[PDB]
Symmetry: D2
Subunit: 208 residues, 4 copies
């Protein structure tokens, strides 16, 4: 089929063109499989400085062997000092989590997002229906940071004095800016005050 | 810390610069977390046309919920027609699989590569030690295609008449070309003749 | 050694001297399901793990549910908790135990969910209250899997149960969440929590 | 219903009327480990799954091994196969069964590994030969996990066993792979396969 022939052609000419014209990783990036812009473009860094895992809806699920293997290898073997969870606006995973459809094996993966919805129902309830998905994309990032900070791998690193920070941002495609959701942890105590403040701030609604 | 401030700065100016100057996915790409060049650069395609999963040593393990969820969502929900496994030269995963070190949780993930080594030991044995890792990177791609073609998700798609092809390439950083290892499957019967021919071809060695 | 050498002797002298239920229990529990229920061998198809969990994304537990439901054609799935559960007590403590703590974070989330109720309770009875609440929550999880909802969708007969076995008196006690469809899952789950919230002196 | 309503009655009238081993068995098997070994309740810490597997990357089975080895401090791990195994027969057939076939591909790889041996054998005895070979291979897998090799490394006492329970005569039969260290794992694994390769008339 033509699409495969086109990759071979696109590849051959790209390599030829790069030649005509003319590394330790420092971050573990946990992003979404349906994110559109690659992390190296968005952050403008050189090849090799990101070690990358991508899964549906940028989740850190307590018992995933694939993501947890990557986090252990990055922290214990490669000695990386910053883990970043990046969500994004118009996320297909989040919309699929709020819809009522049965999609098969993938719905099982998305049930973790539905539990987060009910945790903040009284707030989201006194919000007009059409604004809820944007608030939930924000709250999901805050809860995944809270999850990463509770793993045995991260808590044990903090306990033995290893320097490690956790960050939770949203990539806003409408202006290309990364927006800080306010949960930033360098320890167990900072994880709690920071998580609690962020939710209280997120809970004062526009009177409209 | 400065590295985080530098991402914020790099992001703000990239977004400003893109503005100063100025989508259905078609492939599922299964590549390696330590690959250096992103798939969208290497293949020269526009944002959104690849749905992407990245794990250590580009594996399709029979029972991984993360990778299998992605493959089911791509095939059954998004209707993608081509799955590509891309290995690469100087792969850190493959070298870590051949070394004798205990690295922790990650070694468990790499035990699947060691089983492939023993399957082709008589060939690899009559090869000089220093050339074995390159032959194994090639043979791993051939065996992962063989694995993807045996999953319940792929065999059931073929059985119900859905068009789907599987490909196994190696990205050679030394010339930027993608090299076909010779296993290409559009059905169960083509998977077997093709896999068997490829191994027999890979087994005639340089007399030197 | 000795402990093993003995094992063979026991067996050697012991040798001289279609299942209808899928049972999901705890690796701790000491009385086998077969014993406390008094069933014939081969009647039960069995999975056991730490704190009797149905985690949304576990390939081991999910495979067993699909094989049971789709290939063997079983009509009842039972989740059984128990008092003095090691998994539960481990989840309420603050110790770090390694890889297993990750498996146990699912229980700690359930604790926060019912904090006001548990917080106007006496300290010495809170763990028993959590063991009861856990069972209610795992049945709620089993009823939300794609494998179980698809069987209901297509009209297959399947029922879900959540009980607590008390070692003290040996009696199974029904916790009140019982589902034969998605709507019965909601109503019984909600009624169950409200009853738990009426507290006695 | 009826089947359940009965279950409670049995239990209700039944109620009237530190573990030292980790046991990994098959979800099929019908005689509990506790019965065929004749041990006291609480002595065994139990995990059961389809075809008694130790897959390199299973979080459920690995969690249990770590909790058992690192927190409870158990010194023996036993893998038990059995004759007339449903998982094994399912792996040798060509049918598609759904999600479970993915779990079973690990057995089919083992079959190809010993094809010449099995190919100059009579068709009617090949499955029994594969059941024996599977047990040998899963012990070999358990002995290569990071959790088990790290315990050996640091000097902790731990032994691995691989047996086959024959329903016909009720006797456990040792398949010959027995490991107390990594070197004893290699030698006994190799000797075991060579014996299997001497065939009788
Ligand atoms: Zn997304
Ligand atoms: Zn690699
Ligand atoms: Zn328990
Ligand atoms: Zn069996």
């Amino acid at each position: 089929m033509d699409k495969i022939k086109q990759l071979f052609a696109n590849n051959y000419s790209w390599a030829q063109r790069m030649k005509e014209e003319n590394q330790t990783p420092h971050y573990l990036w946990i992003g979404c499989s349906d994110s559109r812009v690659p992390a190296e473009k968005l952050t403008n860094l050189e090849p090799g400085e990101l070690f990358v895992h991508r899964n549906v809806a940028n989740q850190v699920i307590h018992t995933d062997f694939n993501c947890l293997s990557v986090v252990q290898y990055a922290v214990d073997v490669l000695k990386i000092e910053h883990i970043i969870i990046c969500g994004h606006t118009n996320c297909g995973g989040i919309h699929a989590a709020m819809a009522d459809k049965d999609l098969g094996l993938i719905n099982n993966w998305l049930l973790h997002i539905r539990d987060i919805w009910f945790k903040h129902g009284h707030l989201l309830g006194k919000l007009s229906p059409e604004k809820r998905a944007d608030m939930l994309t924000k709250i999901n990032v805050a809860e995944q940071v809270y999850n990463l900070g509770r793993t045995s791998i991260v808590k044990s690193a903090w306990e033995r004095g290893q320097k490690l920070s956790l960050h939770g941002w949203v990539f806003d495609v409408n202006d290309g800016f990364l927006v800080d959701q306010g949960v930033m942890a360098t320890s167990r105590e900072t994880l709690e005050i920071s998580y609690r403040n962020a939710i209280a701030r997120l809970s004062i609604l526009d009177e409209e």
